[model samples]
Target: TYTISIRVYQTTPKGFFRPVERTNWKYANGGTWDEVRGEYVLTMGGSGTSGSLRFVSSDTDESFVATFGVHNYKRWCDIVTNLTNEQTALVINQEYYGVPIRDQARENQLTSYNVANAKGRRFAIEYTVTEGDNLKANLIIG
Candidate 1:
């Protein structure tokens, strides 16, 4: 069980903004790549962004990686969630489908895994300006 959260916030001259806010979330199978056509392909399944989170499974000892990107208009953020192998290693699960949090949400509601709380559950992602304009993103995990 793994949750991928992404929030797109409006920016300002000094720091942050949230007027033009948009968020996305991917849970379990929602972010896993497919085995069809002999190629890796995953979908974010939302209205905000169009992309999929790919998996790099090198389970030699125990470790996995979630590599995906979001295209917000003219910008994009190639997100990477790494689970470094260790004593209490992290396991990024994959089931080939997305899971809705609420019964109403599943039967009626909702990337779109982003948009969750419980800040400091692990750590926050602070993104620096990569390249230039359109390449904007600031991940506040807390």
Candidate 2:
């Protein structure tokens, strides 16, 4: 089993949960809508600011580095995002074949696999903003 969590950069705040202010544009359903319904994109004064969160995987002996970008990391990390059908595809689809890879979600479930080679091992991931931002993420394994 593994534990993973998000680490966001201060310069670009997380999608921190906040009540929708009445003045903020919202749908008639009392929700903020995005290009995808029932969602909202983070924008800084109407401009999209770029930020990233990196994942580091910990195994028995050493930690493995993840080279995927912020978008990919987000797709895999966020639980809710993982469950959404539309979002899940982007997260798991292979670029060349359009085949689904490891989806934490399928049939509304997260996946689990045995650590065959790394027996007696636990897995973990630490999130970080390593460059172009300030961050530090370290997760323990046992």
Candidate 3:
């Protein structure tokens, strides 16, 4: 069955205990599986294809809190949701480290980071998997 994976890492200040956290999801033509991955608690389902992620920050602020979900194409990369008045900052950078498709040799090592989070960040990561595809995406905090 085709599989998809999303991996994330901690930024400056080193709030999280681990250096990197990730998730693995299986999806194919009518084939599927349940269960969330990594520290991401919130989940999204309904279009057969699902995506999820979580913020591993030590802070208890729900605004900067990390989250991952698969919605529509227009806002699929919209990882950070629920911003409160207490949360007005940066780290809005959804800089994707790398997007390797079909297990090709596109080992372009890109870095990730996260800190004070806010709005106004634009994501260009349009994830679309094809037949027998092994989609791999890396997201960083900053």
Candidate 4:
């Protein structure tokens, strides 16, 4: 069995607590167990042979998903994702800090303030797990 907790911290200030606040989101041991290593692994299954980062966005929702080698040393890197009809590329490093958001193609950074300062704009982070030949953590935006 495995145990894990996922939390979200806002890096901007406007309404609630301080510059940072935890958004009470958690995940507990929701991955597969490897008997040989006695460890839990999240698998990224797709048509691609290697793991990759997936960014999907639409008018209603958006999400970021990452998959890496199960036994390889991995790090999370920062990159920009723009909301456009055209496809874009991404690259990664290990980071648990601020996740960037943008409104156009690789221009300007959007924050909680932008999400809050608008009349019809809102944003949030949520998590989901998929189990099977491919397991992953879905960092969802809504």
Report the number of the highest-TM-score candidate. Answer: 3
Worst 10 residues of 2 by lDDT: 20-29
| Stretches of candidate 3 exceeding 4 Å from the true structure | 17-47, 60-76, 82-116, 119-132
lDDT of 2 by residue, 52-137 (tens): 12222222122211111122212122111112223322232222123243222222121221121133433332344333222233
Residue 61 miss distance in model 1 (angstroms): 2.3
Kindly report which residue stretches of model 2 are placed more than 4 angstroms away from their true locations once superposed: 1-68, 72-99, 103-118, 128-132
User: What lDDT would candidate 3 get against the real structure?
Assistant: 0.32
- Which lDDT tens digits does candidate 4 get at residues 16-129? 321111111112212221212322233332221222233443333433323222222221112223433332222321121223432121122111111221223233322233
For candidate 4, the per-residue lDDT at 90 reads 27
Q: What lDDT score goes with residue 46 in model 2? A: 23
lDDT of 3 by residue, 1-142 (tens): 2344455444445344232223323321222323346622222233223333434333533333232223222113334435545332222322222223311111221122223344333222223332123444445543
**Cα lDDT for residue 24, candidate 3:** 23
Cα RMSD, each candidate = 13.8, 16.2, 11.2, 14.0
TM-scores, each model vs. reference: 0.25, 0.24, 0.37, 0.23
The whole-model lDDT of each prediction reads 0.28, 0.23, 0.32, 0.26
State the number of backbone clashes in model 1. 10
Best by lDDT: 3
